[PDB]
Symmetry: C2
């Protein structure tokens, strides 16, 4: 299983992660969704970025193959603690962070609590602002296992539905039912789900204080997080650039892979 | 005077233009404003792009050093005719077009009337939609010569006012008073100026038909054309990408030069 990588104790949690490349450290933070893992989210990104940077992609606690502590309390602050714990464990004093969706909210929160540990940021279809819950998001967070339910989620994520094959739905369905996966995921964002969008968000006032060079990326057709949310982040963050990909869904790194990788590498190359 | 380049008869008008590089043709179309010329607008862009493309930058009729025909009727359609005439004169059957501001409106109009002659498009703080006239635009089009009036215009264009020096104001003022320059410019967009924004615009219905891969660029702080106009173009054009530069004014190619050049070259490289 390529989703299983290396293991390290971080913030007291046995963590599954990938570490490829050398040089300036870059932390990739995956999004949320049933069966999501660092490898699943970044498999097409790591090869490109690792040619010029040291790429670290961990499975956030509660997702993938990282340990799921008993009675663990999933929260924005606890996830930030996990990210910092991973960096501490690997002696990464400062790094760029790429946050995808849920991970984008965590990236913002990490940059606010640990400004000196974060260099440049890339936020993709990111959580971080209090947007109104979408049917797409309620479907993703409210997922229960079945190939048809997964097919619907993949349709929600994709702009080009031709990419949603029976094989892909089957594979992601299987990932979603691995031991303990659905149990932890379903416990994370219970109804009403607006509460969790809000909890993952940072205040306008706080976001405005971010000094980091930031690259905001969003798929025009994103059905999970409205484009308006990234436009808002683009107005709040001072040193920000906003790049909107037309004909692109929620996962920009998958549907606009080459454009995404090029944009991100050049962005980091400036530093 | 580096603003004076080569001369060629195009659409019956003796045209001043620059032609540098070899390979895939790229037409650069400057914006509008007192003293504006192809060289003034693209001097920092041509060197970069010409390393990989054949770059053609003409002074549109009524601007720069191109002839100003007596009783000439300046119009969107006539300017499009000029662009096509330049391409015909140089045996350029198909080319990418980079339209800055006013030039962006012309690029859209050219792609609509001569779709087969246009490949990829880059539209910067572009005209093309019916946005409400801004004080910045009324100041630019309503300009009358003086170093102080020019200093105000440069302030309107720039995000970083430190770039607006006495020397720059003086040089641009001098460019604005060259023989016949102010006379033709002041005759172009008389009050009420909303009429000209509308005349330079293309309908939503027409824009939606554009099949060209397009890159829309806009400076967050643009005081001349509101960001909302480019966001609208980003929703209307199907194969579009929108890139918003924070801490950037109306002329993105000048204040975010390196980022701009990189983005444009890679965009064209895809073809």
């Amino acid at each position: 299983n390529l989703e299983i990588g290396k293991s390290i104790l971080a913030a007291g949690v046995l963590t599954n992660y990938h570490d490829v490349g050398e040089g300036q450290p870059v932390i990739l933070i995956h999004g949320s969704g049933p069966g999501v893992s660092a490898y699943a989210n970044w498999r097409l990104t790591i090869p490109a970025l690792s040619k010029f940077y040291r790429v670290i992609a961990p499975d956030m606690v509660g997702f993938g193959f990282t340990d799921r502590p008993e009675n663990y309390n999933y929260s924005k602050d606890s996830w930030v603690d996990h990210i910092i714990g991973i960096m501490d464990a690997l002696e990464i004093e400062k790094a760029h962070i790429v946050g995808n969706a849920f991970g984008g909210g965590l990236a913002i929160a990490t940059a606010l609590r640990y400004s000196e540990r974060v260099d440049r940021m890339v936020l993709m279809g990111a959580a971080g602002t209090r947007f109104d819950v979408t049917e797409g998001l309620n479907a993703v967070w409210g997922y229960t296992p079945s190939i048809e339910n997964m097919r619907n989620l993949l349709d929600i994520f994709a702009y080009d539905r031709s990419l949603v094959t029976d094989e892909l739905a089957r594979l992601r369905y299987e990932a979603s039912i691995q031991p303990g996966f659905q149990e932890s995921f379903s416990s994370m964002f219970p109804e009403p789900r607006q509460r969790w969008i809000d909890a993952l968000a940072s205040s306008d006032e706080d976001i405005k204080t971010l000094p980091n060079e930031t690259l905001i990326i969003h798929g025009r057709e994103d059905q999970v997080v409205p484009l308006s949310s990234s436009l808002r982040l683009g107005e709040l963050i001072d040193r920000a650039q906003l790049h909107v990909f037309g004909r692109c869904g929620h996962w920009t790194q998958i549907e606009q892979t080459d454009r995404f990788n090029r944009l991100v590498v050049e962005f980091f190359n400036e530093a």
